[PDB]
Amino acid sequence: GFTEVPFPNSPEFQDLTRFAVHQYNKDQNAHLEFVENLNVKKQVVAGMLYYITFAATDGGKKKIYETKIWVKVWENFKKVVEFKLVGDDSAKLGGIINVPFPNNPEFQDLARFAVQDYNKKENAHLEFVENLNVKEQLVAGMLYYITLVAIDAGKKKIYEAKIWVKEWENFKKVIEFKLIGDDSAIIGGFTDVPFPNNPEFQDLARFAVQDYNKKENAHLEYVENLNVKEQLVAGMIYYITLVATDAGKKKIYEAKIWVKEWEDFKKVVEFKLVGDD
């Protein structure tokens, strides 16, 4: 349980608050100004957790906020795990930020946790393979958007798991788990691409989208990539998993593009809808 702290505006507590306040202001592009910690609690957890009630003005106007700061001084670690204006319907939700290494074992475990969760709830037998993409969001805690590949009935398919985790509590929970559609198998070895949304790759995916548009009389509107995989052959082949809107509806597609630069050769060999349709 929490515990009252008999020194609200302590230098180290005034420290914690402005750390939170600084991040919010920047991540959100705002200008909260810290005045005074009104109240401070403390919970011994995986490390310490401080629930901080403080006063801030936002261009002259008096406002009360609350933040939950997770700290592990033995790692030089402090993460803001909630930030909220009293009262408001909810906590201040952060932007949905993309995470460049979707297969860092911590997300592989999130993914597996979600796959098993679904296996129990649906009496199913899905089989994880890899993550294609992870997005993170500051909520009350963290929410991860995982786009994964799982083998079902022997066939690779793409699923999306939304999972909520309060890491200081060792707590996690599936918020949403849904089938997107069929994955298209790569066959052979591949190299991953750490940043699937570099200009190089955004231009290739846009090329394929226009190619598909022209060829099927469609009007897909490119949004971004989720994942890029490469392999050297004669020239290079890119396997691109991307989102496009089709009449405002977000869809996922898989493109296969074959490039031979000395030939000025660029060819879309496969472009397929995964799902969301």
UniProtKB/Swiss-Prot annotation:
Family, as annotated: Belongs to the cystatin family. Phytocystatin subfamily.
UniProt keyword terms in alphabetical order: Protease inhibitor, Repeat, Thiol protease inhibitor
Keyword field contains Cell division: no
Protein's job: Probably has a role in the plant's defense system.
Annotated positions for site Reactive site: G94, G188
Tissue-wise expression: Expressed abundantly in tuber and leaf.
Residue span relative to the full protein: 384 to 660 of 756
Endpoints of the signal sequence: none
MF term (GO), any: cysteine-type endopeptidase inhibitor activity
Originating organism: Solanum tuberosum (Potato)
UniProt KW Repeat keyword: yes
Organism phylogeny: Eukaryota, Viridiplantae, Streptophyta, Embryophyta, Tracheophyta
Induction: By wounding.
Motif (Secondary area of contact): 43-47, 137-141, 231-235
Protein name: Multicystatin
Domain of life: Eukaryota
Ranges where the Cystatin domain occurs: 1-91, 92-185, 186-277
